[PDB]
């Protein structure tokens, strides 16, 4: 996990530029990558991971959740660089979400979750059948995170493990998810809510 030596040498300029105007900092990375013949997508993704403590996290989240082709490719590279193997599905989703200063936009959050589901699958082809299955599990888990912990909701109205299994029926590429796996998932989210940090009034 390291940036190209030239990016590393120009990090200060890239950081100041990114923080004042994201696209400018990105173009600086792209210009150096062109010069040294390297893939900018992975380079930009690596920079986000490496210089996280120095960047405008809201700007990063916004850039990574954007629909543009370049942005989408950076996100793919960014998420694939994370480790989802040897860490439960719930732990993985928790970590992924905690990485961002989430944008207050459903479409943007959805693109991030989609990126996670894709990466989770590639790293755990034995746990879920495909990306779509991982996405359904993520969606369900997120809905669980909110509903199971809402104080104004009578306990008896909350989804039970039994309910979860019925709701995920045939959601693993036509097949089902192992019952014990779902019981484990339910216990994790129920015992430990997700840590979600969303941006303010203007995302």
Q: Which residues are catalytic?
A: 105
Place of tokens 């989804």: 159
Q: How far apart are CA 137 and CA 61, in angstroms?
A: 22
At a CB cut-off of 8 Å and minimum separation 6, what does 122 contact?
A: 80
Longest CA–CA separation in the chain, Å = 62
The CA R_g of the chain, rounded to the nearest whole Å, is 19
Q: What is the 3-state secondary structure of 43-108?
A: HHHHHHHHCHHHCCHHHHHHHHCCCCHHHHHHHHHHHHCCCCCCCCHHHHHHHHHHHCCECCCHHH
């Amino acid at each position: 996990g390291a940036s190209h030596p030239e990016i590393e040498k120009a990090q200060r300029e890239i950081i100041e530029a990114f923080n004042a105007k994201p696209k400018n900092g990105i173009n600086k990375i792209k210009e150096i990558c062109e010069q040294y013949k390297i893939s900018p997508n992975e380079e930009i993704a690596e920079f986000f991971h490496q210089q996280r403590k120095n960047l405008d996290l809201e700007a990063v989240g916004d850039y990574l959740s954007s629909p543009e082709a370049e942005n989408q490719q950076v996100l793919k590279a960014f998420t694939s660089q994370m480790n989802f193997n040897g860490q439960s599905f719930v732990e993985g989703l928790r970590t992924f979400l905690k990485t961002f200063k989430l944008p207050g936009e459903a479409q943007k959050i959805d693109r991030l979750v989609q990126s996670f589901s894709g990466a989770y699958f590639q790293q755990n082809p034995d746990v879920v059948s495909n990306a779509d299955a991982a996405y359904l599990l993520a969606f369900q888990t997120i809905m669980l995170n909110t509903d199971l912990h809402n104080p104004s909701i009578p306990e008896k109205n909350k989804m039970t493990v039994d309910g979860l299994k019925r709701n995920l029926r045939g959601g693993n590429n036509g097949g089902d998810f192992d019952a014990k796996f779902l019981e484990e998932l339910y216990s994790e989210i129920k015992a430990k809510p997700f840590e979600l940090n969303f941006v303010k009034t203007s995302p």
